[PDB]
Structure 1
Amino acid sequence: PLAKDLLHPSPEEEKRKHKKKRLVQSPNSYFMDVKCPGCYKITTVFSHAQTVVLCVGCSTVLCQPTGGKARLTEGCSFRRKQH
């Protein structure tokens, strides 16, 4: 392919690329809102959390830090936060 269009890479190859190797850098991580089960408030949690998070009402643990992405405990609903 001598005429690959490096000007406008299609989104599927852009996602396929490494994070630093894209045309413009985009972090793979994101921000999500987690609902503490048996509670009422909504907390902000990193997708690649390195520290254990506990919302004030939910005295139990929310995320377990691991290699790449923190493990959400069962019953926690999550949703993205503006890309």
Structure 2
Amino acid sequence: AKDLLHPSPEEEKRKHKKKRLVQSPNSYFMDVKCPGCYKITTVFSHAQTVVLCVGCSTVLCQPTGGKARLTEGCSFRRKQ
């Protein structure tokens, strides 16, 4: 017997994107503080295109299968 009504959060983090009960995704939105000028740029986690900041003309994200890697020393936060 297993409580499917109230499962363990350790299980809920481990299980797949869509196996669990509420089926929320695993991606997030991250705010990148640009090294060049000042600008905070809202960017998606699993971005597919290159992300150019409109002022500084420096490449933020090299898009990769999975989640993109950043350029150099750019923090991020979790917001919902």
- Return 5+ residue gaps in structure 2 as ranges: none
TM-score by length of 2: 0.93
2:32 & 2:78 partners in 1: Cα distance?
10
Q: Which runs of at least 4 in structure 1 moved beyond 4 Å after TM superposition?
A: none
Paired residues, number: 80
The Cα shift of 1:45 comes to 0.8
Residue 32 of structure 1 contacts residue 78 of structure 1 at CA under 8 Å; is this kept in 2? yes
The Cα shift of 1:77 comes to 1.4
The CA deviation string for residues 1-57 of structure 1, in whole angstroms up to 9 with x for no partner, is xx1100001111001111110011010000000011021110011110001011122
TM-score by length of 1: 0.90
2:15 & 2:24 partners in 1: Cα distance?
10
2:32 is aligned with 1:34 = yes
Match of 2:75 in 1: 77
Identity value in percent: 100
The Cα shift of 1:58 comes to 2.6
1:10 & 1:81 partners in 2: Cα distance?
24
Residue 53 of structure 1 contacts residue 62 of structure 1 at CA under 8 Å; is this kept in 2? yes
Q: RMSD between aligned alpha carbons? A: 0.9
1:80 & 1:58 partners in 2: Cα distance?
24
Partner SS, residue 69 of structure 1: coil
Match of 1:63 in 2: 61
Residue 37 of structure 1 contacts residue 58 of structure 1 at CA under 8 Å; is this kept in 2? no
